[PDB]
């Protein structure tokens, strides 16, 4: 049993303000531009998550790759993801996936890593809609 995850990548726009967007609503981006040709790797982080849910902060170390994708013309990619997977003990668990932009990571329009805890609320068309946010900042330490 899988869900159909539709990812849409919109570039930063000074006039749209980046509130959260639920997985069961279509958001047109409010004029911001879809970003084409952005490569994402989707890691199955179910094991890393279930090692300790209360401590999970987005690590995908040693996580297997669930899928890769590249945004199209409309800034979108679609991927069916299993709603359950296995933890490190081999026990069946609700699945968690980490979306990581590998390319082009264009500065302030780089997507922040985000993770997704299935099953999610689906829209009427049956899709799960995610909208990666741009990174909080372009300076870093540590
Ligand atoms: Na696809």
Author numbering: 39 to 180
Excerpt from the publication:
As with other Gram-positive bacteria, sortase-dependent piliation in L. rhamnosus GG (called SpaCBA) is assembled from the ~30 kDa SpaA (backbone), ~20 kDa SpaB (basal), and ~90 kDa SpaC (tip-located) pilins.
Prior to obtaining crystals of full-length E269A-substituted GG-SpaA, this mutant protein had fortuitously degraded to only the N-domain during crystallization. However, isopeptide bonding between Lys47 and Asn172 was no longer visible in the structure. Upon further inspection of the structure, residues (170–180) encompassing the domain linker region exhibit a 34 Å movement towards the AB loop. Moreover, the NH group of the Lys47 side chain shows a ∼160° rotation toward Glu139 and forms a salt bridge. From the structure it appears that the C-terminal tail of GG-SpaA (β-strand G) must be properly positioned to create a favorable molecular environment that then facilitates isopeptide bonding in the N-domain.
